[PDB]
RNA sequence: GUCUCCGUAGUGUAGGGUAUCACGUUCGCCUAACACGCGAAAGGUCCUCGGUUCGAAACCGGGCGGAAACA
RNA sequence: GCCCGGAUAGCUCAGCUGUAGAGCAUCAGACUUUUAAUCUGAGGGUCCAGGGUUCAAGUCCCUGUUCGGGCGCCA
RNA sequence: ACUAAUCGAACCAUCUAGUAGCUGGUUCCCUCCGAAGUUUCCCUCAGGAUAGCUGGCGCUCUCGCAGACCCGAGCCACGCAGUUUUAUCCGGUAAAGCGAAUGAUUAGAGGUCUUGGGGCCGAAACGAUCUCAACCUAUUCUCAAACUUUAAAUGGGUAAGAAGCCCGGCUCGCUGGCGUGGAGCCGGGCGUGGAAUGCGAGUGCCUAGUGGGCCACUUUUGGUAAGCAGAACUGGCGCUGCG
RNA sequence: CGGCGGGUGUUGACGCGAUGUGAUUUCUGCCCAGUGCUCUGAAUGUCAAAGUGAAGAAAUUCAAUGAAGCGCGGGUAAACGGCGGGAGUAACUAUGACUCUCUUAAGGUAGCCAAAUGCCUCGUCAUCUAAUUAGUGACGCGCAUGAAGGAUGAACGAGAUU
RNA sequence: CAGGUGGGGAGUUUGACUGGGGCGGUACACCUGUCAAACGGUAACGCAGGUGUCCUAAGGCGAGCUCAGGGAGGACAGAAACCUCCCGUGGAGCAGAAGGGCAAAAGCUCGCUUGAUCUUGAUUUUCAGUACGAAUACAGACCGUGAAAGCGGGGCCUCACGAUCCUUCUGACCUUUUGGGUUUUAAGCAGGAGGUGUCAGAAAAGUUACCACAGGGAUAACUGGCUUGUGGCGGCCAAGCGUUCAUAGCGACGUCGCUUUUUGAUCCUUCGAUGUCGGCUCUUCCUAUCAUUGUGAAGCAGAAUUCACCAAGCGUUGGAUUGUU
RNA sequence: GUCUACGGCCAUACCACCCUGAACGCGCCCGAUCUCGUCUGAUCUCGGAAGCUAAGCAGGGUCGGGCCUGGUUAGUACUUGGAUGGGAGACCGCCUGGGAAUACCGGGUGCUGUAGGCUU
């Protein structure tokens, strides 16, 4: 699908529409102090081999894309998460699409 | 094996009436819904906004509720061995009036007409509807005629 | 490498005619359902004679083609190759289904039995009724008994039991031969064709001017 | 190996051994569900109801 | 019994917009004569029937014949 | 997921921000009395695509495409 | 192969009464009530949980109890229903239809145009007009589980009153041209108790077994068929003896 | 289990240890792409702990450096193993001595065979019998023979067959 | 202590459904039409299909238009290029499977936009009336569009998807961080995402003929039983063959049966066991009769032969090859 | 008796052709300065009032098509419940209730609300 980068919507800090900045987030790295990141470090510490589930059976293709918003109002950064659905291919801001057109040769 | 999809097996129960397509009629929109009177879920498929599930297709429910476009309906629905009373929002389009609840009070507004009138005068009337009584004598004139001999026909091979 | 017709003489199964979902089908053994002088006109054959069936069954169209095979050749024998028109009216709409077994000593080898037991298009047959017309002849009034004749040969290629009826109507029309001939001459019928028009007294005018000129 | 698959045999006679029971209607049906602009006007009127209260005896009186 | 593939000059052959090549045959070039080589011509209603579209050898359906793979 | 490498005439390989080349294929010439072999010429670049650093980009930088290496793996 | 009659891991004791959704067994009498093999979920399919079916314990009410013997002195219970009736809706099966749509399909007839073949003597303006095609028109034969105008029987919902009907009045921040609309509330009056039939109802807690089914009429799917496999309805067998 | 413990070893390459094949005779063909094994690092990719540097108040975070191994590159088939297709091509057809190609690397060489290895198969031909799905001999596009195992060859066998 | 190697050794796993199991397939989570028997519900490895996507517009408004096809015309131009008129109930299009729906629409072309936004509850669908998913009607904000009424919180409707634990991001000058205080850090509260397709959601390769155990006739391999497609044996009609002539002897196209000596189909009995091929031996039975007895028919001159009737009394052999039937 | 504006039901109203239309009205019609749109003042928007019922529209007509409603089809098809009814079956008959649809043959061809005009 194809998303533009800008666009104006509900901003929960401003408590009204404003314009919103839109990009793609991405997951962060793991902090290794993360209180399931200990437990986990120390039940593997030792003997026992592995202590915990390896998924290894992955049955999605896609992920659902979310867009990172952020407000442009100078006093208000604030962010926020929105979802869309599952997509294969995804663009940020492309060119959009134009109907009376000719199929290139 | 049969899917639970919403609209399963709703091909002809949603489907328009035969040269009945087209724009919806606009008395339906103005009809007027009161809570507590008495309405028919029919469930046309012009709209498909609001639409009854197809289990309340053909049944009869109480208004409770009322919105600016649709009512809140108590409906019964038999689940197995129980019956429970389920409450649906339906647009105003698969709605319409019952004239079951107005057949009888039309029996009312008369039965209390007629009950202030043997009141007023002094004469009892009978006001219980009864079952169909067995017919009583009565002549039957022959009017100068023999009733008319019938006899079977014989049988023929047509085709 | 057909069954026997005892496997499918009844009418078991719903109307499975060839559509978009039954593909695959085989076409039938008849392809000719109208023989003799189609071209005749409506007078000259005032006679017709029925073969009717008395069992709700199926014909299949084997058979309906033997039937029709041996019924034209006793009637070119017997009335020439121009004194009479046949019709079968019985079309094998209906097909039916084989689920082919391995014919060898072996169960193992992919018999598997009754598992995806719906089987492949076999052939055709022609659902039909009682009191429903196999098949017609229409001739002359001097051929009544070599069409009775006819239909009684034709019947030994039918499962069930077969009347021989001599109808009222005249010849392939729906009008009965007693009125037939007045209302032609009053104009109530147009020939044409093999058959008749029926002219209803409505519709425009010019209609009926047209006639009576 | 393989088992019957679903049937509903015998189960109405089930149904019908304790009776299929209609709901229990009565008085003064539960209003939730109901509009909620509608119902916090409704509790409005009941809270001022009470003034009036001798314009109502005085009328009736 | 089923599945898959194929049914085209005499032969093997490729192939929606009127059939290519080679051999088989004939002829013409070249030689003093021959052989070869070059070139031209003839030769396939495209297995059969039915169907859609402007038009089918090609696409679709049915049926025959032949060859592998299952059975 | 991280650190890397590559992607081009029909086929293959080399390449300078200042004008893409070489061989094998095709075609046509040259050498020879002639055929081969040999020499030349012509055409041919799915420069992997897009945006940019860029006066200049096949080259350099990011984003994808597959082709691949070495790692890493608690829903 | 052999390793004390033991070897694809000896023998002895112990952990150890190892675990078992699987097999077998499970001890006196009478009385009362009395099933399920179905729904949903489960590495679930020889098992569980869950709803259903069962039992036990109740509790809340209704009818009156009658005359010391004898002897009633329009109107006659809360409420309920695998039933009918009276109204009122719902439906697309059976049937029917194809000269009605969508598909399929037979045969003639009448027409005038065409990239129909062509066609007897017409290049010549087929001087001509004979035929076969396609097409059109009005008819014609045969059809449909996944077609349909029409359309049953059986069937499903609702209503058949006192929680009803009719009069006034008050409240509202909702609605609003308006003493508007709507809802709520407060008084008052109406009883011939507003179909038939039958029956006493309501409500709570705890809960076992079951969760392999099978058969028959009729409807019905796959299959040539089956004492086959799979559904719907009711009844039965299972759990039941007797003629 | 452990000790600079112990076996080979009271030993020392004509020796110990690990494998395959299986006397003699005669041969032991092609393939290092794959998986193994092994060898040099040639800049070189990846790569832990420790150590080093920077930021921070510290926990900590980041960066640089780069052991073995893997990867890259050589060798190795009496290591495991593999030894197919397609196009053109000789003056009757037919085959292909010859020339090219594709999957990867090489295309089954010498030999042997319906063999204890061949489905079709009771293969076909000769012989043996009156008659032989048996035996022997021969043929070989061999479903699916084949070279540390192939082909022979006396003697021997409580081995299988005529 | 760290990294590599490490079936030498250890522990464990190696789904389910299933006309036995395996191979195949997914009927394992879903959607359309039918089955389905005119409310709803309803099964099979029933039938015809589809799904794990796509879309900044193909979402939201508003405006203006009319689509498929056909007829008749117009330079190249022809069956199809474009222009014009007329007819045109949708015979088109609406992303996809199908069904429903739709015409100054829901289709096509434009203009402006982001209601595909921030929130709390209720309800419907599967349903146990649990969840997820999807959906309906409201209510409170903030907006878009339009002159406005209004419409819009994704796609005209029916599908297009995902718990606990953990991780990651976002939000509250929010709470806690353990004797107090400041600051990092960490924990929490609310909402998105990273996924379990065996789709209410373990982390999982084989082999065993050296095998074992608990069971199962809930379940195959051999008999028996139902059936008789297939095999075998008959009948009816008679187009034809028979130099001629349907029927001496045959019998195409059809069609009706019988048998259980074939092979299937099923899974009712048997898994705390019914000894599983063939041959040898021996007895009895059936007749659909090869021979023999008595017969009828012939395309029966004789001889030989062929068809049929009563008929199972009696007989039906010796060998090569092959385990063989 | 009609029309106009807005309608309700949505063919008894639709479709094809022909005839008639007095008065208002509705329209055709004239023009492009402004408003506003076009390739084109054709459409749309605007400003008008010379002509006209030619068309739209209204009413009527057609042994008209369709539609609506009856008859026939037909107590037929089908069907609830019943039988130790028939038949080898296929299926069929009866009892008890209910009960259609074509073809064919008749009749009809918009009713009406609100507000405002015209018609001696
Ligand atoms: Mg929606
Ligand atoms: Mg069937
Ligand atoms: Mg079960
Ligand atoms: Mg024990
Ligand atoms: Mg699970
Ligand atoms: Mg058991
Ligand atoms: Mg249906
Ligand atoms: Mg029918
Ligand atoms: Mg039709
Ligand atoms: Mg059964
Ligand atoms: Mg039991
Ligand atoms: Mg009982
Ligand atoms: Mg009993
Ligand atoms: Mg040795
Ligand atoms: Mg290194
Ligand atoms: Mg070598
Ligand atoms: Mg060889
Ligand atoms: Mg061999
Ligand atoms: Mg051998
Ligand atoms: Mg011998
Ligand atoms: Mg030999
Ligand atoms: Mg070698
Ligand atoms: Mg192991
Ligand atoms: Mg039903
Ligand atoms: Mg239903
Ligand atoms: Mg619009
Ligand atoms: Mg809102
Ligand atoms: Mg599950
Ligand atoms: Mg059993
Ligand atoms: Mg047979
Ligand atoms: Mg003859
Ligand atoms: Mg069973
Ligand atoms: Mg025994
Ligand atoms: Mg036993
Ligand atoms: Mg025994
Ligand atoms: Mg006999
Ligand atoms: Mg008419
Ligand atoms: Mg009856
Ligand atoms: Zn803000």
């Given at each position: 699908?194809?998303?533009?980068?800008?666009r104006?919507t509900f901003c929960?800090k401003?408590?009204?529409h404003?314009?919103?900045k839109?990009?793609?987030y991405?997951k962060g790295?793991?902090?290794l102090y993360?209180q399931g990141?200990?437990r986990?470090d120390?039940k593997?510490?030792?003997?026992?081999?592995?202590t915990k589930?390896?998924?290894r059976?992955?049955?999605?293709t896609?992920?659902?894309?979310?867009?990172r918003?952020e407000?442009?109002?100078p006093?208000?950064?604030?962010?926020?998460?929105?979802?869309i659905?599952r997509?294969?291919?995804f663009?940020?801001?492309?060119?959009?699409?134009?109907?009376?057109?000719?199929?290139?040769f | 094996?049969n899917t639970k999809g919403?609209?399963?097996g709703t091909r002809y129960?949603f489907?328009?009436?035969?040269?009945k397509?087209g724009?919806?009629?606009?008395?339906?929109?103005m009809?007027?819904y009161?809570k507590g009177?008495?309405?028919?879920?029919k469930?046309?498929?012009?709209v498909?906004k609001?639409?009854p599930h197809?289990?309340?297709?053909?049944?009869?429910?109480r208004?409770?509720?009322?919105?600016?476009?649709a009512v809140?309906?108590?409906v019964?629905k038999?689940?197995?061995?129980?019956?429970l009373?389920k409450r649906i929002?339906?647009?105003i389009e698969?709605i319409?009036?019952?004239?079951?609840?107005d057949s009888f009070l039309?029996?009312?507004?008369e039965?209390?007409q007629?009950?202030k009138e043997?009141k007023?005068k002094?004469t009892?009337?009978?006001?219980?509807?009864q079952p169909?009584?067995?017919?009583?004598?009565h002549?039957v004139?022959?009017?100068?005629?023999?009733?008319?001999?019938?006899?079977?026909?014989?049988?023929?091979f047509m085709? | 490498?057909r069954?026997?017709?005892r496997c499918?003489?009844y009418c078991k199964n719903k109307?499975?005619?060839k559509?978009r979902?039954?593909?695959?089908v085989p076409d039938?053994?008849?392809?000719?359902f109208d023989?003799?002088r189609?071209?005749?006109?409506?007078?000259?054959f005032?006679?017709?004679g029925?073969?009717?069936?008395?069992?709700?069954?199926q014909?299949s169209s084997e058979a309906?083609?033997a039937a029709r095979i041996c019924?034209?050749?006793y009637?070119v024998?017997?009335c020439?190759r121009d004194?009479?028109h046949?019709?079968v009216?019985?079309?094998?709409?209906?097909?039916?289904?084989i689920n082919?077994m391995?014919?060898?000593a072996?169960?193992?080898?992919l018999?598997?039995?009754?598992?995806?037991?719906?089987?492949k298009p076999?052939?055709?047959?022609?659902?039909?009724?009682?009191?429903?017309?196999?098949?017609?002849?229409?001739?002359?009034?001097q051929?009544?008994?070599?069409?009775?004749?006819?239909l009684?040969r034709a019947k030994?290629?039918?499962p069930?039991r077969?009347?021989?009826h001599?109808?009222k109507?005249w010849?392939?029309?729906?009008?009965?031969?007693d009125?037939?001939?007045?209302?032609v001459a009053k104009?109530?019928?147009?020939?044409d064709?093999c058959?008749?028009?029926?002219?209803?007294?409505?519709?425009?005018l010019?209609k009926?001017?047209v006639?009576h000129? | 190996?393989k088992s019957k698959?679903?049937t509903?045999?015998?189960?109405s006679?089930?149904?019908?051994?304790?009776?299929?029971?209609?709901?229990?209607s009565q008085?003064?049906?539960?209003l939730?569900?109901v509009?909620?602009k509608f119902?916090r006007?409704?509790?409005?009127?009941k809270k001022?109801?009470?003034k009036?209260?001798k314009?109502?005896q005085?009328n009736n009186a």
């Amino acid at each position: 699908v194809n998303v533009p980068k800008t666009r104006r919507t509900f901003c929960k800090k401003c408590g009204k529409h404003q314009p919103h900045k839109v990009t793609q987030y991405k997951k962060g790295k793991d902090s290794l102090y993360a209180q399931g990141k200990r437990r986990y470090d120390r039940k593997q510490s030792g003997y026992g081999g592995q202590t915990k589930p390896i998924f290894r059976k992955k049955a999605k293709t896609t992920k659902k894309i979310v867009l990172r918003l952020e407000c442009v109002e100078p006093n208000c950064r604030s962010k926020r998460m929105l979802a869309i659905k599952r997509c294969k291919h995804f663009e940020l801001g492309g060119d959009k699409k134009r109907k009376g057109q000719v199929i290139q040769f | 094996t049969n899917t639970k999809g919403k609209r399963r097996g709703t091909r002809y129960m949603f489907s328009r009436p035969f040269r009945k397509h087209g724009v919806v009629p606009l008395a339906t929109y103005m009809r007027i819904y009161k809570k507590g009177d008495i309405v028919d879920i029919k469930g046309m498929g012009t709209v498909q906004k609001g639409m009854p599930h197809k289990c309340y297709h053909g049944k009869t429910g109480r208004v409770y509720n009322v919105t600016q476009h649709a009512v809140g309906i108590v409906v019964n629905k038999q689940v197995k061995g129980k019956i429970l009373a389920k409450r649906i929002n339906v647009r105003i389009e698969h709605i319409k009036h019952s004239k079951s609840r107005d057949s009888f009070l039309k029996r009312v507004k008369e039965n209390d007409q007629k009950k202030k009138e043997a009141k007023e005068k002094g004469t009892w009337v009978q006001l219980k509807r009864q079952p169909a009584p067995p017919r009583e004598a009565h002549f039957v004139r022959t009017n100068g005629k023999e009733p008319e001999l019938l006899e079977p026909i014989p049988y023929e091979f047509m085709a | 490498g057909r069954r026997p017709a005892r496997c499918y003489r009844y009418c078991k199964n719903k109307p499975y005619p060839k559509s978009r979902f039954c593909r695959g089908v085989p076409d039938a053994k008849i392809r000719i359902f109208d023989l003799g002088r189609k071209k005749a006109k409506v007078d000259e054959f005032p006679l017709g004679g029925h073969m009717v069936s008395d069992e709700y069954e199926q014909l299949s169209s084997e058979a309906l083609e033997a039937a029709r095979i041996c019924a034209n050749k006793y009637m070119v024998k017997s009335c020439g190759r121009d004194g009479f028109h046949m019709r079968v009216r019985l079309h094998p709409f209906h097909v039916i289904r084989i689920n082919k077994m391995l014919s060898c000593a072996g169960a193992d080898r992919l018999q598997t039995g009754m598992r995806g037991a719906f089987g492949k298009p076999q052939g055709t047959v022609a659902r039909v009724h009682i009191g429903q017309v196999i098949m017609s002849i229409r001739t002359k009034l001097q051929n009544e008994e070599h069409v009775i004749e006819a239909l009684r040969r034709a019947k030994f290629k039918f499962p069930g039991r077969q009347k021989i009826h001599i109808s009222k109507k005249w010849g392939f029309t729906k009008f009965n031969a007693d009125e037939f001939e007045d209302m032609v001459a009053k104009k109530c019928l147009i020939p044409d064709g093999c058959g008749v028009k029926y002219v209803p007294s409505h519709g425009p005018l010019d209609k009926w001017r047209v006639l009576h000129s | 190996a393989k088992s019957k698959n679903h049937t509903t045999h015998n189960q109405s006679r089930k149904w019908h051994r304790n009776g299929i029971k209609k709901p229990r209607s009565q008085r003064y049906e539960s209003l939730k569900g109901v509009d909620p602009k509608f119902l916090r006007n409704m509790r409005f009127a009941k809270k001022h109801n009470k003034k009036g209260l001798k314009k109502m005896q005085a009328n009736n009186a």
